[PDB]
RNA sequence: GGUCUUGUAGCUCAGUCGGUAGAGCAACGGUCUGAAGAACCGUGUGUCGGCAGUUCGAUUCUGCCCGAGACCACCA
RNA sequence: UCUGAGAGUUUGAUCCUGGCUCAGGAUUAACGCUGGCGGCAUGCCUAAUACAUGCAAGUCGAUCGAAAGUAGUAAUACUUUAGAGGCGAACGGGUGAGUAACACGUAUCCAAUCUACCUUAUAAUGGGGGAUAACUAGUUGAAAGACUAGCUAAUACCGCAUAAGAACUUUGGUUCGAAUCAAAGUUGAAAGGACCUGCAAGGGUUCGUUAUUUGAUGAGGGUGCGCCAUAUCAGCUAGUUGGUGGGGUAACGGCCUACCAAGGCAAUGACGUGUAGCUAUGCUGAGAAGUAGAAUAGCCACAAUGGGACUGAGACACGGCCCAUACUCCUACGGGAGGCAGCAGUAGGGAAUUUUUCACAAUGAGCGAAAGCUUGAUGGAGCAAUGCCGCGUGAACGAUGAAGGUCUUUAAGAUUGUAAAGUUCUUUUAUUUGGGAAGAAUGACUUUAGCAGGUAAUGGCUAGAGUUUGACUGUACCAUUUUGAAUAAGUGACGACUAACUAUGUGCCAGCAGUCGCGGUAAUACAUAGGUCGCAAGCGUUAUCCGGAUUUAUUGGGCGUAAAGCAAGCGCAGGCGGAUUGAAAAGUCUGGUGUUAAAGGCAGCUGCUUAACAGUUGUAUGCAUUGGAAAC
């Protein structure tokens, strides 16, 4: 599937909040564990490398929404260069166009960013794209086809949204550039290299 | 088949007859030379040999070879 | 014409009409890309002059590719 | 090219309805010969009246065969309707697809049970204003025998619901007309003028997309399978997409050639004896007698409940009664699929006559639609006829 | 379709074979019978499995359930 | 498309002169094996694929079909 | 630089030894459920089985005669070719039964060879004759055809003189089987066309042609090298190992013949069986290596089977011929026709492999000064989830948790679940509006402008003008182009091996299962339902490959008791070999030179919205030679 469908279910299972801090605190019944009825107490007897690798693969895959064929091919593209594959892979994961526009703060959710990018309303260097996973280069300028600036959802997203040092942006113009690579401390720390590069026994 | 094939065949009957007639006269002259050895018959034989070698009817190499073999028997005689 | 569908490309190579195209060739001379314009064409004219001097020329339109280049105006003197 | 054929004149399909030994084969030969001597492009045919063994060795019709012939007024096709039983499915196959059926009865071979059943089935399935032609009058010339048959054919045609008093009667001799006796051509001209009058046509409309009743399947060397039939509605051009329907899962197909009588069409028509080449299909999945439609909207069905016009036993109904377990052969516009008369609880034995409303269950999912006229038969005798009132599943 | 004669196992509830039917054969390894390793593939144009096969409808040739 | 053929217990199989339904097996119970097999006794079952006739009288003889099995479609 | 995982399976229990299974990819995949689009790849692997019809080989009237027809009163000009003649007809395409060897690829030598046209350079293009076509007529038969007589052209044919150069041999001369030279005999080349100028006499240009020389080009041959198994395969073998002369091929060559000898190969594997088109490469792989030798491109074979021969410069010739054979077919009885492994396409075999689609628009080829012609090559189009890749099937907001369903099992509640409902916003795609490509950034073409030869003028080299060639296309694409959340998720598994539990049903029956094995009356392994997790217009399931599998261990095992030291001794060949001095380098290492087709992969870049993919640049490898070092 291209998308997760429901999100809070996965985040309940992922144990991580894709949002800033909160996805649910009192929804009739709050839980910090797996959803469903079977989740009475099943998290303390499944400690295994296989389970950890699968869980973290789902965490980072659900964190951005990349299908397994695409997820594999993107890792191979990361293997293309040597660099430092750990930080290089993390920088590629955040370099997706939807993640780019999320970090400059014009979207409240990555699903909204994907939906907006797919409709062709986001113009990239005078040539728009329909693939919401574009890999960028430092110094890329964006603009959103200024008609779509009048959108109430975009307005409620972009008034005081995500402020980042590695990307320069202006909400008085809704435009910006990619200054530099983000630092690891500025990215979610619940994602590690070792388990998924191990589950990468393929390559 | 093709109309061009029939065009080729009706034409090539005559040239096949011409080639066999030329081969017959070459062989007759060769036999005459081997009946009596002299430069008189050999001059003729080399003449039509060159004329046939003028076209692709006989390769020039085989003619040079047989003509060398004939000039050899002239030389030892 | 090689590459992708709706994407023509023509490597410039000394060839004779006794061998089919994209089969076996003699020696590479360059490549011509008719897919994208603005004069994409690179030539060597190092042994191509010798090939012209000894016959067995490549295709005829290549003649024109050296008319703009100017090899023709300098070939006749080599020719005579 | 495959000898392209085109025509703009209206096409009325005319057949020789009546039992064998009536001179019907000789009449089919004679009409072709006289129009050969009357109209251009009317090539003669006597060995081409039939195309199968025992079809010509007997001289009297057994199985189907198609002939084509045009006059200086109108074009006509003809299918060779059978005689004796065990082949009646072919005659109704024709009887469903003709709009003109000349009653070729013989004065010396006066209306036989096969002929009377042919007329009754024409009434049941619907043959509008079918004309009569007394035949084989070269034998047994009598003062009143030639006229008692002429009055009784009118009586029998008025005894089913048709118009036996609104049809001109022309006599003739099959052998004398075919051989070329000059005085018998006036009578075949009279017959042609008779099928010119009060014989309608399948209405000309291109707005209807598609529907065809299959009659035969013939595989052609190299081309594939050219399946032939008669169009009920719609017009057809090469390159269009269609869907096969009937007794099999509906599958899409593409037309690649349309023909009259192995001569390629330009524009098909409803009622035309058409033949269409289909790609990627073999006789195993395309069935002789299937139906076909435009892709998108058609539904096969098994069970349906309709008002049936129970024909009276004196009018030709069943010889006896029937229970729920009665299993007669339903005739749907292209095929005899045999179903069961599942009587609703009206009486223990519904009798012929006194038209009822019954539900029926069929083993095969066949295309059904409300109002579509269908026939009910059993072993050479019609036991019912009507149109669909409600389609269930 | 060749002269080889082989024993095989029918999976699922019941059967739809009538002693004269052609169907497809698959491999596999079951250990309840020596030698017997091949099985019959249901739902291939002849014998078909239609017994509320809602889950695992890929094998047995069972159509997707209707809404 | 026609040429014939088949329809018997739940399964595989014969069918009294239209006048009667007959075997084995799964199969219900009992004896017996530590247990399960194997062996032995008794049970059971069919309104004989369905409709209408001929019919005191039909699985049976016909007319109807259906599910199925075999014979071919030349020519040129 | 590159570059690496294991887990379970023996027993009462433990370990070792070995075996087994699972987990990665990958297709020429097939197949079940189903399915939205797009780029791209790819689409008979079976019967080298046979196959309706059509296309796939024509061009040239500036090679030639004649003829028709059109216009013209006519003269004449114009279209066309039945023919004759020229070129391609060998390539272009498909296929891999046959074919284990020079077939493959590489390195050479052809002092043993050929090569029309294309390149260099140069002498000639003079003269005559002869016939056949076509046509006219007859014979012959249904036909294919065949035969006979009279009348025609040439750049078709044949003689006739001439011979820079060339042909042979001979004498003299030179060089390490050959090369250069001087001389003595002998031979042989044809054709004109178009145009221009010139009264003529002639001259000029181009094309065409003979001859000669330079090349290149391709063809032919030999050569070592490495590339299947098979000793439950041991002798094989005589134009066969040779020598002598001749015939013979382009050419060496028992290639073949007349003659004379008896060798040669083989245990380091002949011969024999079975199997195979080969290579690059495709895949696995980290790596030594393995597998396949889809497509694809290079090499070879082949054209219903088997032979024979002509022509072409080159053939025993995918759409040449003749014949035999087999098949099919016409047939009036007398005769004949054909070969889809050329494009399709059909029958059938399978589990399965695409339409009698378009255009020669590009390109390329073939023909022809020239208009122009052919191309089922090729460039497109359609079908197929067969494969890879990209994208939609909405998004944001939205709690005691709506209904319902399930569990807890009633009587709180939880679960599905912000998921629902409801509120807005947006339209890749879906529906409409208008415009719209490049590919035609090659080319003729007649007029301009300049330019080499010589001039008397044509003709040729280059720039400018346009006619211009578009099937694809109103296509890619472009745009505050209308409407519309609408037009669009299935699917394997949940005992463990390896993430994924409850309820009901069955009761070693029914079933599942790759492994251990679960089930014989509460089954976390069966049946169903719910929940759940996995992948997704795809999900699975079978074949073949490799990793694992160190599971024949080159790297990277051993052989005391788990598997094996022959029962032992003598010993040929071969392998491994003491120390020191010298030689060269046969190896070894290394420098230079050439090849190592393109292409594949790798590293970098460019382009299509990014992709996928394609192209661009570099990147290895083995030998051949030359030049160094001399440790082993």
Curated annotation (Swiss-Prot), chain A:
One of its GO terms (molecular function) is rRNA binding. The keyword Membrane does not apply. One of its GO terms (cellular component) is small ribosomal subunit. GO terms for biological process: ribosomal small subunit biogenesis; translation. Residues 95-156 form the S4 RNA-binding domain. Belongs to the universal ribosomal protein uS4 family. This is Small ribosomal subunit protein uS4. Gene3D superfamilies: Ribosomal Protein S4 Delta 41, Chain A, domain 1 (1.10.1050.10), RNA-binding S4 domain (3.10.290.10). HAMAP family: Ribosomal_uS4_B. Part of the 30S ribosomal subunit. Contacts protein S5. The interaction surface between S4 and S5 is involved in control of translational fidelity. InterPro entries: Ribosomal_uS4, Ribosomal_uS4_bac-type, Ribosomal_uS4_CS, Ribosomal_uS4_N, S4_RNA-bd, S4_RNA-bd_sf. The keyword Methyltransferase does not apply. Keywords: Ribonucleoprotein, Ribosomal protein, RNA-binding, rRNA-binding. One of the primary rRNA binding proteins, it binds directly to 16S rRNA where it nucleates assembly of the body of the 30S subunit.
UniProtKB/Swiss-Prot annotation, chain B:
This is Small ribosomal subunit protein bS20. Belongs to the bacterial ribosomal protein bS20 family. NCBIfam families: S20. Keywords: Ribonucleoprotein, Ribosomal protein, RNA-binding, rRNA-binding. It comes from Mycoplasma pneumoniae (strain ATCC 29342 / M129 / Subtype 1). GO terms for biological process: translation. One of its GO terms (cellular component) is ribonucleoprotein complex. Coiled coil: none annotated.
From Swiss-Prot, chain D:
Residues 9-203 form the tr-type G domain. Its main location: cytoplasm. It is an enzyme of class 3 (hydrolase). InterPro entries: EF-Tu_GTP-bd, EF-Tu_GTPase, EFTu-like_2, EFTU_2, G_TR_CS, P-loop_NTPase, Small_GTP-bd, T_Tr_GTP-bd_dom. It holds the Pfam family GTP_EFTU_D3. Residues 18-25 are annotated as: G1. This is Elongation factor Tu. It comes from Mycoplasma pneumoniae (strain ATCC 29342 / M129 / Subtype 1). The gene is tuf.
Curated annotation (Swiss-Prot), chain E:
GO terms for biological process: translation. Keywords: Ribonucleoprotein, Ribosomal protein, RNA-binding, rRNA-binding, tRNA-binding. GO terms for cellular component: small ribosomal subunit. This is Small ribosomal subunit protein uS12. The gene is rpsL. The chain holds residues 71 to 137 of 139 of the full protein. Part of the 30S ribosomal subunit. Contacts proteins S8 and S17. May interact with IF1 in the 30S initiation complex. It comes from Mycoplasma pneumoniae (strain ATCC 29342 / M129 / Subtype 1) (Mycoplasmoides pneumoniae). Belongs to the universal ribosomal protein uS12 family. With S4 and S5 plays an important role in translational accuracy. One of its GO terms (molecular function) is rRNA binding.
């Amino acid at each position: 599937m291209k998308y997760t469908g429901s999100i809070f279910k996965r985040s309940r299972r992922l144990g991580f909040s894709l949002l800033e801090n909160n996805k649910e605190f009192s929804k009739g019944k709050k839980r910090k564990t797996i959803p469903g009825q079977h989740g009475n107490r099943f998290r303390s007897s499944t400690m295994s490398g296989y389970a950890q690798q699968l869980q973290e693969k789902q965490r980072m895959q659900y964190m951005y929404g990349i299908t397994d064929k695409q997820f594999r091919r993107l890792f191979r593209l990361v293997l293309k260069q040597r660099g430092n594959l750990a930080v290089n892979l993390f920088r590629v994961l955040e370099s997706r166009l939807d993640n780019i526009v999320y970090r400059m703060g014009f979207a409240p959710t990555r699903r909204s960013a994907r939906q907006l990018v797919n409709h062709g309303h986001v113009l990239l260097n005078d040539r728009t794209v329909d693939t919401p996973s574009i890999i960028l280069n430092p110094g890329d300028k964006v603009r959103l086809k200024a008609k779509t600036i009048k959108i109430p959802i975009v307005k409620a997203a972009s008034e005081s949204g995500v402020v980042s040092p590695f990307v320069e942006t202006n909400n008085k113009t809704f435009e910006g550039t990619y200054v530099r690579f983000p630092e690891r401390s500025e990215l979610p720390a619940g994602i590690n290299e070792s388990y998924v590069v191990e589950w990468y026994k393929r390559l | 088949n093709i109309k061009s094939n029939e065009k080729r065949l009706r034409q090539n009957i005559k040239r096949n007859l011409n080639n066999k007639g030329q081969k017959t006269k070459l062989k007759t002259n060769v036999k005459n030379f081997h009946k009596e050895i002299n430069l008189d018959n050999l001059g003729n034989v080399y003449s039509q040999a060159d004329r046939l070698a003028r076209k692709g009817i006989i390769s020039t190499n085989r003619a040079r070879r047989l003509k060398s073999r004939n000039v050899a028997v002239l030389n030892k005689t | 014409r090689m590459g992708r569908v709706h994407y023509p490309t023509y490597r410039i190579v000394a060839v004779d009409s006794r061998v089919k195209r994209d089969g076996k060739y003699i020696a590479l001379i360059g490549h011509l890309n008719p897919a994208l314009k603005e004069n994409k064409c690179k030539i060597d004219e190092a042994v191509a002059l010798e090939w012209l001097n000894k016959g067995a020329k490549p295709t005829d339109t290549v003649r024109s590719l050296f008319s703009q280049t100017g090899l023709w105006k300098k070939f006749v003197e080599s020719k005579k | 090219a495959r000898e392209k054929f085109d025509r703009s004149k209206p096409h009325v399909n005319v057949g020789t309805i009546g039992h064998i030994d009536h001179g019907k084969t000789t009449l089919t030969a004679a009409i072709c010969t006289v129009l050969a001597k009357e109209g251009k492009s009317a090539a003669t045919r006597y060995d081409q009246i039939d195309k199968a063994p025992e079809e010509k060795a007997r001289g009297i019709t057994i199985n189907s065969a198609h002939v084509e012939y045009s006059s200086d007024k109108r074009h006509y096709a003809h299918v060779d309707c059978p005689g004796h039983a065990d082949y009646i499915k072919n005659m109704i196959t024709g009887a469903a697809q003709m709009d003109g059926a000349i009653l070729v009865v013989s004065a010396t071979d006066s209306v036989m049970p096969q002929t009377r059943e042919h007329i009754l089935l024409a009434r049941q399935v619907g043959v509008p204003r079918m004309v009569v032609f007394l035949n084989k009058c070269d034998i047994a010339t009598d003062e009143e025998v030639q006229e008692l048959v002429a009055e009784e054919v009118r009586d029998l045609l008025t005894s089913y619901g048709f118009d036996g008093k609104n049809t001109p009667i022309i006599y003739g001799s099959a052998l004398k007309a075919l051989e070329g006796d000059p005085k018998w051509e006036a009578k075949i001209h009279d017959l042609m003028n008779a099928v010119d009058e009060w014989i309608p046509t399948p209405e000309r409309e291109v707005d209807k997309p598609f529907l065809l009743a299959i009659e035969d399947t013939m595989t052609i060397t190299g081309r594939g399978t050219v399946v032939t039939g008669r169009v009920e509605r719609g017009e057809l051009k090469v390159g269009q997409e269609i869907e096969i329907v009937g007794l099999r899962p509906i599958r899409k197909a593409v037309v690649t050639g349309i023909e009259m009588f192995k001569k390629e069409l330009d524009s098909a028509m409803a009622g035309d004896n058409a033949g269409v080449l289909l790609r990627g299909v073999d006789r195993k999945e395309v069935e002789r007698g299937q139906v076909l439609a435009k892709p998108g909207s058609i539904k096969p069905h098994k069970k349906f409940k309709a008002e049936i016009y129970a024909l009276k036993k004196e009018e030709g109904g069943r010889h006896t009664g029937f229970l729920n377990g009665y299993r007669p052969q339903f005739y749907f516009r292209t095929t005899d699929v045999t179903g069961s008369i599942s009587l609703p609880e009206n009486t223990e034995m519904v009798l012929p006559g006194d038209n009822t409303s019954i539900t029926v269950e069929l083993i095969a999912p066949i295309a059904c639609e409300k109002g579509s006229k269908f026939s009910i038969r059993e072993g050479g005798r019609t036991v019912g006829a009507g149109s669909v009132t409600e389609v269930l599943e | 379709t060749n002269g080889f004669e082989v024993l095989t196992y029918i999976p699922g509830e019941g059967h739809n074979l009538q002693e004269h039917s052609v169907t497809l054969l698959r491999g596999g390894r079951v250990k309840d019978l020596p030698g017997v390793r091949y099985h019959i593939v249901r739902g291939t144009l002849d014998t078909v499995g239609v017994e509320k096969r809602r889950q695992q409808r890929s094998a047995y040739g069972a159509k997707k359930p209707k809404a």
